[PDB]
Design a protein around this ligand. Sequence first.
Ligand SMILES: Nc1nc2c(ncn2[C@@H]2O[C@H](COP(=O)(O)OP(=O)(O)NP(=O)(O)O)[C@@H](O)[C@H]2O)c(=O)[nH]1
Ligand SMILES: [Mg+2]
Length: 253
Amino acid sequence: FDFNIMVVGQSGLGKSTLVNTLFKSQNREEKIPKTVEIKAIGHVIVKMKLTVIDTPGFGDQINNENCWEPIEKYINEQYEKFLKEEVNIARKKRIPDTRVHCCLYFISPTGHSLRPLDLEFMKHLSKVVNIIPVIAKADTMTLEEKSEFKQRVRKELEVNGIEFYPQKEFDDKTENDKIRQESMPFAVVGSDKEYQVNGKRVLGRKTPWGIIEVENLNHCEFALLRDFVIRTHLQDLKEVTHNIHYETYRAKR
Ligand SMILES: Nc1nc2c(ncn2[C@@H]2O[C@H](COP(=O)(O)OP(=O)(O)NP(=O)(O)O)[C@@H](O)[C@H]2O)c(=O)[nH]1
Ligand SMILES: [Mg+2]
């Protein structure tokens, strides 16, 4: 039972922190280093082997042309691996799946229109993998700002024809419309540090004006994202990956 999630997005958006938050919500609090290479972190949780693929952020160069190619390369490498092991010569009953089933795309909360780089990046990934749009560091927005920006992001994904998951043509539609039009993009806060609020140990960030709680729906939507990818839509993510994306890959070969 393998499930593989990738995080991608501009450097400094809290991708690695959210990776740790995902695992920890499911005992030291050391500083998280800037990510230099693509690394697959796997832990066993019925029993599910959850692997999260951390990636070096992009967009930190003067010229960011073709910066998506390392990510595309990794994704295609897992397809090629699965393709080659499908021919189960070893006669194994179960075949290991390292294919990216889900890609969280981190969007910086600028309050303005989506950046051409992100639009191009998402356009590329959307045709090879399931992408889920996430607004990073949601604590940097007020309530009013966040509502406006979520609406703006939805509109701009729509006008640019970015087919993020759940792709409309794969539906349930009552639940999904709620997802595409209300739940997404998930505005998240990450932290693998714990604090005490009203007696409860909670994952959060401690500011001079208050404590931001990661799993508190009054503060952010990390809980909704986690539930979505780990519980309610996990099998569906795997199904679209195998039957649509991987088959698209297989045919292109
Ligand atoms: N305000 C805020 N800061 C956050 C949040 N998550 C992480 N940070 C902080 O943002 C900084 C960068 O986090 P990091 O997880 O390393 O980002 P990254 O996207 O992995 N960077 P890279 O792609 O270079 O490896 C750290 O100081 C971290 O504590 C968040 O939700 N809100
Ligand atoms: Mg990182």
